[PDB]
Amino acid sequence: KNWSALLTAVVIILTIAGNILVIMAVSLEKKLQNATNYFLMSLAIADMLLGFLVMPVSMLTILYGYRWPLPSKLCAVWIYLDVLFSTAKIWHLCAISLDRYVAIQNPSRTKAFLKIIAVWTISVGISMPIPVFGLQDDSKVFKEGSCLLADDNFVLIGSFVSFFIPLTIMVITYFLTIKSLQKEAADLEDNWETLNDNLKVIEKADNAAQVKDALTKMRAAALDADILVGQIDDALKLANEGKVKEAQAAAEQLKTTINAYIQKYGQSISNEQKACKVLGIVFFLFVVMWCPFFITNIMAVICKESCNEDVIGALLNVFVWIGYLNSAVNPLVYTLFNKTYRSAFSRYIQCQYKE
Numbered sequence: 001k002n003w004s005a006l007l008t009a010v011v012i013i014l015t016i017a018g019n020i021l022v023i024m025a026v027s028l029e030k031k032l033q034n035a036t037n038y039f040l041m042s043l044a045i046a047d048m049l050l051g052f053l054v055m056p057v058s059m060l061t062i063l064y065g066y067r068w069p070l071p072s073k074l075c076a077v078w079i080y081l082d083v084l085f086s087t088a089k090i091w092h093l094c095a096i097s098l099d100r101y102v103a104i105q106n107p108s109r110t111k112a113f114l115k116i117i118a119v120w121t122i123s124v125g126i127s128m129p130i131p132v133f134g135l136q137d138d139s140k141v142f143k144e145g146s147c148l149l150a151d152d153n154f155v156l157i158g159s160f161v162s163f164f165i166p167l168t169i170m171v172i173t174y175f176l177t178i179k180s181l182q183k184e185a186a187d188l189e190d191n192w193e194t195l196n197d198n199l200k201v202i203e204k205a206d207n208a209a210q211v212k213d214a215l216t217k218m219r220a221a222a223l224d225a226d227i228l229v230g231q232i233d234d235a236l237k238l239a240n241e242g243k244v245k246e247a248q249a250a251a252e253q254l255k256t257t258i259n260a261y262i263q264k265y266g267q268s269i270s271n272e273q274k275a276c277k278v279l280g281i282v283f284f285l286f287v288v289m290w291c292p293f294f295i296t297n298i299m300a301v302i303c304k305e306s307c308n309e310d311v312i313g314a315l316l317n318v319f320v321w322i323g324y325l326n327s328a329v330n331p332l333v334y335t336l337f338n339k340t341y342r343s344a345f346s347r348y349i350q351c352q353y354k355e
């Protein structure tokens with residue numbers, strides 16, 4: 001036996017215990033019902049299934065010295081589900097990254113479920129050559145009787161199509177979301193300045209022209225950022241007919257609507273930027289905990305006869321469990337950085353499920 005098998009059992013349990021709680025948070029808690037949290041439930045389904053189906057079999061092969069213990073046609077099915085769940089996880093993290101970017105310049109639950117299912121079928125068919133060709137040829141899924149994807153052309157093209165190019169789309173759209181929110185925070189500090197400057201011009205004004213000019217540029221700023229434009233227009237026609245102090249008074253009625261609207265839109269930018277940061281920790285620890293696998297497995301293919309394929313193959317049996325450990329940690333990120341997730345799990349650990 002191995003103490004490694006003991007450590008893996010913990011990693012199976014943390015994966016199964018943590019991700020069920022994530023599925024229980026998103027299914028039960030009303031504050032986790034947006035589209036991103038629907039993807040994080042679907043991601044936790046991929047994590048829960050990897051802990052149930054893939055990760056205990058990988059522990060079983062640790063116990064048999066990576067000689068495959070099961071039926072030989074269960075190898076390509078096991079590598080298919082292994083590659084499927086993780087490929088779903090990267091295309092999920094890519095879909096979160098992309099859909100938060102598009103949600104800024106397009107301002108349903110069903111729409112989430114069309115996207116999730118599109119990401120699942122993309123992953124079902126990208127991973128489809130593993131049972132199609134590996135069940136017809138044991139040399140694609142076996143190496144010295146070790147079940148592992150043995151064809152280098154599957155490992156090169158599977159890493160490029162299902163790990164490199166979703167990570168590339170992920171890291172672009174994350175950088176562009178970060179810049180979009182920084183422009184949106186800067187656009188609304190700018191319109192806050194144009195509103196607050198013209199409100200102070202109106203409260204100094206002796207003549208109708210200075211109220212009318214300052215409300216015109218207030219009507220411009222509000223149009224750029226919602227329905228207080230009409231209130232600004234109501235005050236615009238008060239200034240237009242010489243009623244200076246009555247237009248000045250109605251701009252003070254603007255100052256209460258402005259502070260409400262600015263602060264509400266200014267809280268949702270810091271909601272978005274908080275949420276972008278938590279997703280970026282999720283994105284980061286996916287790639288970092290799978291980087292030692294993929295880079296070794298491509299340095300496997302580059303120095304093939306040169307390097308020790310039994311050392312490389314032993315590193316990859318360890319590096320696969322760095323990436324399996326990632327399945328457990330997306331729930332831990334949600335405890336640390338989202339009070340709604342931290343509270344939901346808290347209540348479920350106390351067996352308290354009533355909303």
Ligand SMILES: O=C(CCCN1CCN2c3cccc4[nH]cc(c34)C[C@@H]2C1)c1ccc(F)cc1
Nearest residue numbers: 082083086087090148149162163290316317320
């Ligand atoms: O496909 C995956 C997970 C890889 C993990 N699989 C585990 C089973 N088995 C191996 C075990 C031990 C050594 C091994 N060398 C080669 C392989 C292998 C093949 C195969 C790989 C994936 C896909 C997209 C992502 F974004 C992130 C991970």
Ligand SMILES: [Mg+2]
Nearest residue numbers: 193194196197
């Ligand atoms: Mg100013």
